[PDB]
């Protein structure tokens, strides 16, 4: 349930594989247009490693399809995010999440 | 300031003198219009009923709040037709008594298909005569009204004032009636004839 | 208040009609709360059925044009939260409209959406050309139906379905609105009622009343009028924009480098900040 | 107290005509006549100019006669137009009138 | 329920002073084209993405104020129903972003060229990025105003307007039938880049407060000559109407002699040859009758404007001096044209105002006649394309040409006064247009 729509092209050659740390800058909004999270506000890039289930499964496939330097828009269905339980106080249940993710680098 | 009605009677409580025309003989050479338009005004009342959204009826009744004896010409008795012409008869007497000769330039001739309206404009010289005739409507109306009122000697009707003094809202009654007669004379081509002042010369 | 035979209403009256110094001009009214269409649309006696009424997504409200108010000077419908057209000579031709058309590499239009900020009907379309008596004995009761699960909007003249209809996109916010030029002491009346197997507006405006078929007029719901001018605060700093003619072949250059940020307070129901 | 009687203009206009008609009354003593005239002068000083239109219409018929009864209307007209000259002359009219 | 807060960037719009529109009888062309080239964009100068949109906006309604507004602020092109923008990935209108497909979709980046086409006939707005068509068009929108190019942006951008001609060479050839936007600049104004409805600007000693700005309307480009349906000229005016055409032709021929025109079988401005540049009588009658229709209106407009004119003097017409061209200032033919000598003639200040009104009407009559023939206004003259720099209403005309028409009408009035005919200046009726 992840759809990846490109915003700005990357290198198109290097892609993140399993066990590699991904450094991304993201801004997450509900699909109706309400923002709820953004790494830009904290002014600190978000780091995570693929395959360790550190993030929601929607980010697992979405970032894997992106290249280094690419900025893309990921639309994640409720099943590939928090879903029925949701995130209490942040994300309502059965909410589709839209993310503007830029893959800064891999480490 | 320029007065819209730049004219006056230049005459003289208030006694509205009517116009004496019964003494003088009424010319009947134009009887093709005298009788036709006399019943045409009441024919226009039939068109006024369909605009009232309540149609005409034969039986006399006070529930229809319209004319109770208005009937189609097939079953329209002429007893009312032969009494509604009197206001028109004196109306033609009135406009011909004020040294206004009328000449028929042209030579020709249940719903009044030709619609008589009053929203169109007209020339100043000819419209001035209509307003003068409308004045004669008011003073004759004032004369008969004051005859009943003069039996008391105290008070007066609020509209017992000269025609030029009363405002337009209370004038539209006689104004439209005189204009409507002139409009009928307009499309047929009746020439009635007995000034040219610019707006600058009309300033106070 | 809603009686046994009438629903709760918000009636507008002209205080100084007929008297000297009375103000007569186009009046743009709307209700204070919107109805929001669903995020996703569905694919493809006189008693409400309990199962139908609890599963329907159609909502109804009506406007009563009192006798004496000319229907030709009344417009009834909905407005989006971005309506700012204070036209003293308003008619349906002044309504903002635009069509966005998408296609493939060679024509072949596959999507043609229609956008507007005002979805209304003219009261002059619901009057027969009678000879006269245009001020009718019966008040004109224009009803509006919105289906939040399909984005379809329909109207009724006096219980007869009208030909005009509108289609809107999901997540659209619509405010019940009436544009009227007063011609009588009694002008209009928002009727927050319901039809058979159709929920009232209070069921759509409030989360706690989604399954309540009883019409309600809570205090937050009120009539709002369009005010042409309002006070606004001037920003303390403005973007420094440099404009110059770079040359005959380079054209005119626009440049802005220094960032500026403001803290915006957003009102959710009005979709403005 | 007659300053804002626009809502009852019909009754106020009738009052003005009656008191004026009383002034033009035979079998009235000189002392009685001035009391009627003083009342008419006082009323026209506070009544709005728009509500004096009908009274002026009656005066147009009577004042040009210039008989012995025309003395009071001449003074009444003098005070009216001196007080309300902006109502008739200025294109914008008198303020709030 | 609770009020929401967030940090947003300020967005400002910049437009050229180029205004186009469509109206019945308007003198403006229908199809326009311009380009915007992106030189430098910082994708994230702040926590919020950089704003950059290109498109068209309507004069009556598009007033983006700095700060708050619809949605979450930062309103630019396409954030209302008066503007239609394009940011590289979406078509913006009514504060709604609709994705659009183009070869190599990406957000507006440096070295990108955006081509915007405006066809008011449909009406339709289309875009091209780097020469490839954008598969999405705005259409069936309102036309009650004037359209201008506009770019909305936040801090961290650097773009250049390409308007054609000497104001930015086009990177790509415009589609056939479309005209460069530089041709739409009015004669009285110079092309420049300005903000939109600003209430504040920088000044020498401090910020300057600015009130509302006077804006033109689409109806301002529609000539409105006075009505001349009432074609009833007095017989003395009718006969002198043709003689008026004789005199104005000589005056028009005389002014051409100052410009260097000589007699010639061919009538060309550059060749400076004119068959009329011999004499009014030697001028061919059919050529004289070319302006007889215009000459008839000139006297007719006097009656139409309300002027009282009659044959006050007949002996004055019989005897009058004739100015002749100097023998030194001769044409190819060598004859001396003899226009009426009216040096002794003087005009009252009220009559001078009448000449201005006559000149304005004469231009409008010519303007609406050309519009019916398909002519349209353009900064650059193109006879095969029927584009004329003077195809504009008289009020929008530049003073240099405005004075030229005024002088010609003055001689025509002088000719009437030379004949001794009385000319009564009408009592001018003031009016308030209420443009805004
Ligand atoms: N009959 C007319 N024909 C042409 N222009 C006229 C006429 N009457 C007035 N004008 C004015 O002349 C100007 C335009 O003239 P135009 O461009 O046609 O001149 P030209 O090129 O010298 O003439 P031509 O096209 O006959 O060679 C405008 O200001 C217009 O108002
Ligand atoms: C006001 O009136 C005008 C104003 C300007 C011009 C003309 C007539 C003339 N027209 C063509 C023309 C030229 C010469 C003659 C002639 O000499 O007979 C007739 C017509 C366009 C050229 S500029």
Are E12 and A41 within 8 A, CB to CB? no
**CA proximity to E64, closest of E189, E3, E140, E154:** E154
Are E163 and E36 within 8 A, CB to CB? no
Are A95 and A36 within 8 A, CB to CB? no
- Neighbouring C-beta atoms of residue C223, cutoff 10 Å: 16
Give the pairing of strands E308-310 and E422-424. Answer: antiparallel
Q: Would an 8 Å CB–CB cutoff place C39 in contact with chain A? A: yes
Q: Give CA–CA dist E111/E157, Å, rounded.
A: 12
Chain B residues whose CB is inside 8 A of the C130 CB are: 53
Are C31 and C175 within 8 A, CB to CB? yes
SS3 E213: coil
Are C260 and E9 within 8 A, CB to CB? yes
Q: Where are the alpha helices (DSSP H) in E70-197?
A: none
**DSSP states along C203-262:** HHH-GGGTT--S----TT--EEE--S----PPPSS----EEEEEETTTEEEEEE-S--EE
Q: Give CA–CA dist D22/D20, Å, rounded.
A: 5
Chain C residues whose CB is inside 8 A of the E98 CB are: 100, 102, 113
Using CA atoms in the order B39, B45, B47, B48, what is the torsion angle rounded to 10 degrees? 170
Q: Give CA–CA dist B126/B175, Å, rounded.
A: 14
SS3 E80: coil
For chain A, the residue count is: 107
Orientation angle between helical segments B124-149 and B85-97, nearest 10 degrees: 120
Are C154 and C167 within 8 A, CB to CB? no
Residue that is written with structure tokens 């303390």 in the block: C236
Q: Give CA–CA dist E116/C81, Å, rounded.
A: 29
CA Rg value for chain D: 14
Q: Give CA–CA dist A104/A34, Å, rounded.
A: 24
Q: Which of A15, A37, A48, A100 is catalytic?
A: A37
The set of long-range contacts for A11-15, using a CB threshold of 8 Å and a minimum separation of 24, is A11/A67, A11/A68, A11/A69, A11/A70, A12/A67, A12/A70, A13/A67, A14/A67, A14/A68, A14/A106, A15/A64, A15/A65, A15/A66, A15/A67, A15/A68
Are E113 and E106 within 8 A, CB to CB? no
Are E87 and E60 within 8 A, CB to CB? no
**DSSP states along B113-124:** -S-----S---H
Helix (H) or strand (E) holding E33: strand E31-41
- Cross-strand partners of C13: C186
- Cα-Cα end-to-end distance for chain A: 27
**CA proximity to A99, closest of A31, A23, A10:** A31
- Sequence-distant (6+) residues with CB within 8 A of D23 are D33, D36, D37, D40, D69, D72
Distance from the Cα of C236 to chain A's closest Cα (Å) equals 23
Chain B residues whose CB is inside 8 A of the C133 CB are: 51-53
**C271–E158 C-beta distance less than 8 A:** no
- Sequence-distant (6+) residues with CB within 8 A of D32 are none
B136-175: string of b/e by CB count within 10 Å (b at 16+)?
A: bbbbbbbeebbeeeeeeeeebeeebbbbeebeeeebeebb
Chain D residues whose CB is inside 8 A of the B11 CB are: none
Q: Which CATH architecture has domain A1-107?
A: Roll (3.10)
- Neighbouring C-beta atoms of residue C134, cutoff 10 Å: 14
Q: Give CA–CA dist E2/E25, Å, rounded.
A: 53
Distance E362 CA to ligand 1 centre (A): 10
Q: Give CA–CA dist B135/A66, Å, rounded.
A: 94
- Cross-strand partners of E20: E147
CA Rg value for chain A: 13
Using CA atoms in the order E168, E171, E173, E178, what is the torsion angle rounded to 10 degrees? -40
Q: Give CA–CA dist B23/B93, Å, rounded.
A: 11
**DSSP, res E2:** P
**CA proximity to C77, closest of C38, C122, C113, C37:** C122
E234-267: string of b/e by CB count within 10 Å (b at 16+)?
A: eebbeebbeebbbbbbbbbbbebbeeebbbbeee
For chain D, the residue count is: 97
Verify whether residue A82 is a known catalytic residue: yes
Q: Give CA–CA dist C140/E101, Å, rounded.
A: 48
**CA proximity to C98, closest of A81, D21, E94:** E94
Distance from the Cα of C137 to chain E's closest Cα (Å) equals 38
SS3 C29: strand
- Neighbouring C-beta atoms of residue D70, cutoff 10 Å: 16
Q: How many CA atoms lie within 13 A of A6 on its CB side?
A: 18
Chain A residues whose CB is inside 8 A of the E52 CB are: none
**D61–B14 C-beta distance less than 8 A:** yes
For chain C, the residue count is: 273
**CA proximity to C70, closest of C160, C157, C134:** C134
Give the pairing of strands E376-377 and E387-388. Answer: parallel
Are C81 and C175 within 8 A, CB to CB? yes
Q: Give CA–CA dist C172/C116, Å, rounded.
A: 11
**DSSP, res C120:** E
- Neighbouring C-beta atoms of residue E127, cutoff 10 Å: 23
* Tokens read off for D22: 């009383």
E288 lines ligand 2 (CB under 6 A): yes
**CA proximity to A56, closest of A32, A33, A37, A34:** A37
* Tokens read off for C136: 């009718």
Are E402 and E327 within 8 A, CB to CB? no
Are C60 and C199 within 8 A, CB to CB? yes
Q: Give CA–CA dist D26/C39, Å, rounded.
A: 89
Q: Give CA–CA dist E307/E295, Å, rounded.
A: 17
* Tokens read off for B59: 């039986």
Distance E249 CA to ligand 2 centre (A): 7
SS3 B184: helix
Residue C31 has phi, psi (to 5 degrees) of -80, 155
Are A19 and A49 within 8 A, CB to CB? yes
Distance D45 CA to ligand 1 centre (A): 67
- Cross-strand partners of C154: C145, C165
Distance from the Cα of C44 to chain A's closest Cα (Å) equals 21
Question: Could you tell me the CA-to-CA distances from A21 to A80, B103, C42, E199 in Å, in that order?
Answer: 21, 110, 41, 51
Q: Give CA–CA dist C260/C237, Å, rounded.
A: 8
- Residues with Cβ within 6 A of ligand 1? E 269, 291, 294, 362-363, 366, 390, 401, 405
Q: Enumerate the domain spans of chain A.
A: 1-107
Distance E291 CA to ligand 2 centre (A): 6
What is the CA angle E186-E188-E194, rounded to 5?
A: 70
Q: Would an 8 Å CB–CB cutoff place C171 in contact with chain A? A: yes
Are E396 and E186 within 8 A, CB to CB? yes
- Neighbouring C-beta atoms of residue D13, cutoff 10 Å: 18
Burial of D31 (0-12, 13-18, 19+ CB in 10 A): exposed
* Tokens read off for E217: 């309307």
Verify whether residue A26 is a known catalytic residue: yes
Are E99 and E82 within 8 A, CB to CB? no
* Tokens read off for E45: 């100068």
**A43–E47 C-beta distance less than 8 A:** yes
Residue that is written with structure tokens 């005739």 in the block: B133
- Candidates C174, C236, C252: best to mutate against E (most CBs of E within 10 A) is C252
**CA proximity to E62, closest of E123, E121, E147:** E147
- Sequence-distant (6+) residues with CB within 8 A of B122 are B130, B179, B182, B183, B186
Are C151 and C170 within 8 A, CB to CB? yes
Q: By CA distance, what is C131's nearest residue in B?
A: B51
Q: Give CA–CA dist E249/E276, Å, rounded.
A: 8
Burial of E313 (0-12, 13-18, 19+ CB in 10 A): middle
Chain centre distance of CA E172:
27
What is the CA angle B35-B38-B40, rounded to 5?
A: 110
Q: Where are the alpha helices (DSSP H) in chain D?
A: 9-23, 30-46, 53-62, 71-83, 85-89
Distance E351 CA to ligand 2 centre (A): 24
- Neighbouring C-beta atoms of residue D10, cutoff 10 Å: 10
Question: Could you tell me the CA-to-CA distances from A24 to A49, A68, B113, B197, E51 in Å, in that order?
Answer: 11, 9, 84, 89, 21
Q: Give CA–CA dist E180/E163, Å, rounded.
A: 6
SS3 A28: strand
Q: How many B-C residue pairs are in contact by the CB < 8 A criterion?
A: 10
Are D83 and D48 within 8 A, CB to CB? no
Q: Give CA–CA dist E93/E79, Å, rounded.
A: 6
Q: Give CA–CA dist A24/E281, Å, rounded.
A: 89
- Sequence-distant (6+) residues with CB within 8 A of C43 are none
Burial of C199 (0-12, 13-18, 19+ CB in 10 A): buried
Q: Where are the alpha helices (DSSP H) in E169-305?
A: 235-259, 285-288, 292-304
Question: Could you tell me the CA-to-CA distances from E89 to A62, E63, E139, E343 in Å, in that order?
Answer: 19, 24, 19, 70
Q: Give CA–CA dist C32/C175, Å, rounded.
A: 7
Q: Which of A76, A80, A82, A91 is catalytic?
A: A82
Chain centre distance of CA D5:
15
E335 lines ligand 2 (CB under 6 A): no
**DSSP, res E430:** -
Using CA atoms in the order B18, B24, B29, B31, what is the torsion angle rounded to 10 degrees? 50
- Sequence-distant (6+) residues with CB within 8 A of B22 are B93
Chain centre distance of CA E268:
26
Q: Which of A15, A46, A56, A100 is catalytic?
A: A56
Q: Give CA–CA dist C67/C137, Å, rounded.
A: 6
From which experimental method does this structure derive? cryo-EM
Chain centre distance of CA E142:
21
Q: Give CA–CA dist B32/B102, Å, rounded.
A: 13
Q: Give CA–CA dist E324/E322, Å, rounded.
A: 6
Distance from the Cα of C49 to chain B's closest Cα (Å) equals 42
């Amino acid at each position: 349930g992840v759809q990846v729509e490109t915003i700005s092209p990357g290198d198109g050659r290097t892609f993140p594989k399993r066990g590699q740390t991904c450094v991304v800058h993201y801004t997450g909004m509900l699909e109706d247009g309400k923002k709820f999270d953004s790494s830009r506000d904290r002014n600190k890039p978000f780091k995570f490693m693929l395959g360790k289930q550190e993030v929601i499964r929607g980010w697992e496939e979405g970032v894997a399809q992106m290249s280094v330097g690419q900025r893309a828009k990921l639309t994640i269905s409720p099943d590939y995010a928090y879903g029925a339980t949701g995130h209490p106080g942040i994300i309502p249940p059965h909410a589709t999440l839209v993310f503007d993710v830029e893959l800064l680098k891999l480490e | 300031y320029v007065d819209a009605s730049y004219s006056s009677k230049a005459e003289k409580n208030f006694d509205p003198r009517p116009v004496e025309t019964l003494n003088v003989i009424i010319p009947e050479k134009l009887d093709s219009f005298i009788n036709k338009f006399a019943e045409y005004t009441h024919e226009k009342w039939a068109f006024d009923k369909i605009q009232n959204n309540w149609s005409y009826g034969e039986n006399v009744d006070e529930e229809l709040k319209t004319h109770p004896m208005l009937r189609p010409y097939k079953t329209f008795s002429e007893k009312d037709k032969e009494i509604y012409r009197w206001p028109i008869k004196e109306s033609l007497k009135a406009m011909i008594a004020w040294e206004w000769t009328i000449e028929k330039a042209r030579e020709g001739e249940y719903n009044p298909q030709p619609p008589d309206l009053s929203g169109v404009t007209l020339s100043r010289e000819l419209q001035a005569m209509a307003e003068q005739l409308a004045e004669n409507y008011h003073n004759t109306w004032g004369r008969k009204k004051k005859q009943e009122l003069e039996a008391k000697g105290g008070g007066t009707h609020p509209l017992l004032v000269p025609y030029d003094t009363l405002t337009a809202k209370e004038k539209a009654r006689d104004r439209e009636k005189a204009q409507e007669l002139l409009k009928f004379l307009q499309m047929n081509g009746y020439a009635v004839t007995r000034l040219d002042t610019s707006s600058i010369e009309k300033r106070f | 208040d809603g009686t046994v035979d009438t629903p709760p209403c918000l009636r507008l009256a002209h205080r100084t009609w007929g008297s000297q110094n009375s103000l007569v001009e186009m009046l743009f009214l709307r209700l204070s709360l919107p109805v929001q269409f669903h995020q996703h649309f569905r694919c493809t006696d006189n008693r409400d059925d309990p199962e139908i009424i609890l599963n329907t997504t159609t909502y109804y409200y009506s406007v009563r044009v009192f006798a004496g108010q000319e229907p030709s000077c009344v417009w009834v419908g909905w407005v989006t939260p971005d309506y700012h057209q204070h036209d003293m000579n308003f008619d349906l031709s002044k309504v903002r409209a635009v069509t966005v058309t998408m296609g493939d590499e060679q024509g072949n239009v596959h999507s043609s959406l229609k956008c507007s900020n005002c979805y209304m009907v003219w009261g002059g379309d619901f009057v027969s050309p009678g000879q006269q008596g245009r001020i009718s004995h019966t008040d004109l009761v224009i009803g509006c139906l919105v289906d939040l699960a399909t984005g379809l909007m329909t109207f009724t003249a006096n219980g007869k379905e009208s030909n005009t209809f509108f289609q809107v996109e999901p997540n659209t916010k619509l405010f019940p609105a009436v544009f009227v030029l007063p011609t009588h002491q009694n002008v209009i009346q928002f009727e927050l009622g319901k039809q058979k197997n159709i929920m009232p507006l209070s069921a759509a405006m409030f989360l706690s009343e989604r399954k309540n078929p009883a019409p309600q007029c809570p205090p937050r719901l009120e009539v709002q009028m369009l005010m042409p001018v309002s006070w606004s605060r001037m920003p303390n700093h403005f973007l420094q924009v440099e404009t110059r003619r770079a040359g005959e072949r380079l054209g005119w250059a626009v440049q802005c480098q220094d960032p500026l940020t403001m803290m915006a307070l957003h009102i959710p129901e009005e979709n403005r900040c | 107290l007659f300053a804002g009687t626009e809502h009852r203009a019909i009754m106020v206009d009738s009052m003005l005509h009656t008191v004026y008609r009383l002034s033009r009354g035979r079998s009235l003593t000189k002392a009685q006549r001035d009391v009627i005239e003083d009342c008419l002068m006082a009323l026209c000083r506070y009544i709005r100019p728009s509500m004096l239109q009908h009274l002026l219409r009656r005066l147009v018929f009577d004042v040009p006669i210039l008989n012995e009864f025309a003395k009071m209307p001449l003074k009444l007209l003098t005070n009216h137009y001196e007080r309300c000259w902006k109502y008739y002359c200025l294109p914008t009219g008198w303020a709030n009138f | 329920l609770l009020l929401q807060t967030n940090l947003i960037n300020y967005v400002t719009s910049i437009r050229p002073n180029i205004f186009v529109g469509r109206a019945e009888g308007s003198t403006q062309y229908g199809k326009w084209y311009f380009e915007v080239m992106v030189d430098e964009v910082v994708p994230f100068l702040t926590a919020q993405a950089t704003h950059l949109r290109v498109g068209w906006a309507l004069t009556e309604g598009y007033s983006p104020y700095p700060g708050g507004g619809e949605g979450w602020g930062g309103n630019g092109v396409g954030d209302d129903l008066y503007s239609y923008g394009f940011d590289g990935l979406h078509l913006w209108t009514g504060h709604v972003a609709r994705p659009v497909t183009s070869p190599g979709q990406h957000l507006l980046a440096p070295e990108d060229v955006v081509s915007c086409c405006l066809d008011l006939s449909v009406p339709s707005i289309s875009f091209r990025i780097n020469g490839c068509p954008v598969q999405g068009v705005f259409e069936a929108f309102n036309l009650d105003g004037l359209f201008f190019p506009v770019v909305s942006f936040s801090a961290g951008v650097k773009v250049r307007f390409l308007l054609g001609g000497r104001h930015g060479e086009f990177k790509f050839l415009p589609p056939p039938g479309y005209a460069p936007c530089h041709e739409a600049v009015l004669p009285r104004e110079r092309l420049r880049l300005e903000p939109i409805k600003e209430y504040r600007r920088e000044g020498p000693r401090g910020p300057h407060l600015v009130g509302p700005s006077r804006c033109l309307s689409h109806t301002d480009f529609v000539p409105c000559p006075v009505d001349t349906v009432q074609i009833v000229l007095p017989p003395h005016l009718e006969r002198i109407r043709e003689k008026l055409a004789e005199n104005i032709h000589e005056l028009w021929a005389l002014t051409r002699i100052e410009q260097g025109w000589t007699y010639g079988p061919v009538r060309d401005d550059n060749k400076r040859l004119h068959p009329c540049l011999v004499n009014f009588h030697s001028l061919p009658e059919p050529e004289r009758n070319y302006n007889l229709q215009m000459s008839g209106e000139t006297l007719k407009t006097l009656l139409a404007l309300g002027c009282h004119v009659g044959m006050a003097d007949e002996k004055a017409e019989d005897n009058l001096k004739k100015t002749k061209l100097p023998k030194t200032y001769m044409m190819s033919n060598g004859y001396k044209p003899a226009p009426l000598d009216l040096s002794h003639v003087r005009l009252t200040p009220a009559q001078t105002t009448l000449v201005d009104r006559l000149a304005e009407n004469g231009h409008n009559v010519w303007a609406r006649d050309r519009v019916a023939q398909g002519w349209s206004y353009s900064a650059v003259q193109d006879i095969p394309a029927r584009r004329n720099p003077r195809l504009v209403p008289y009020r929008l005309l530049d003073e240099a040409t405005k004075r030229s028409n005024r002088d010609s009408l003055c001689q025509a009035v002088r000719t009437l006064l030379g004949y001794g005919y009385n000319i009564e200046p009408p009592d001018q009726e003031p009016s308030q247009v209420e443009n805004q």
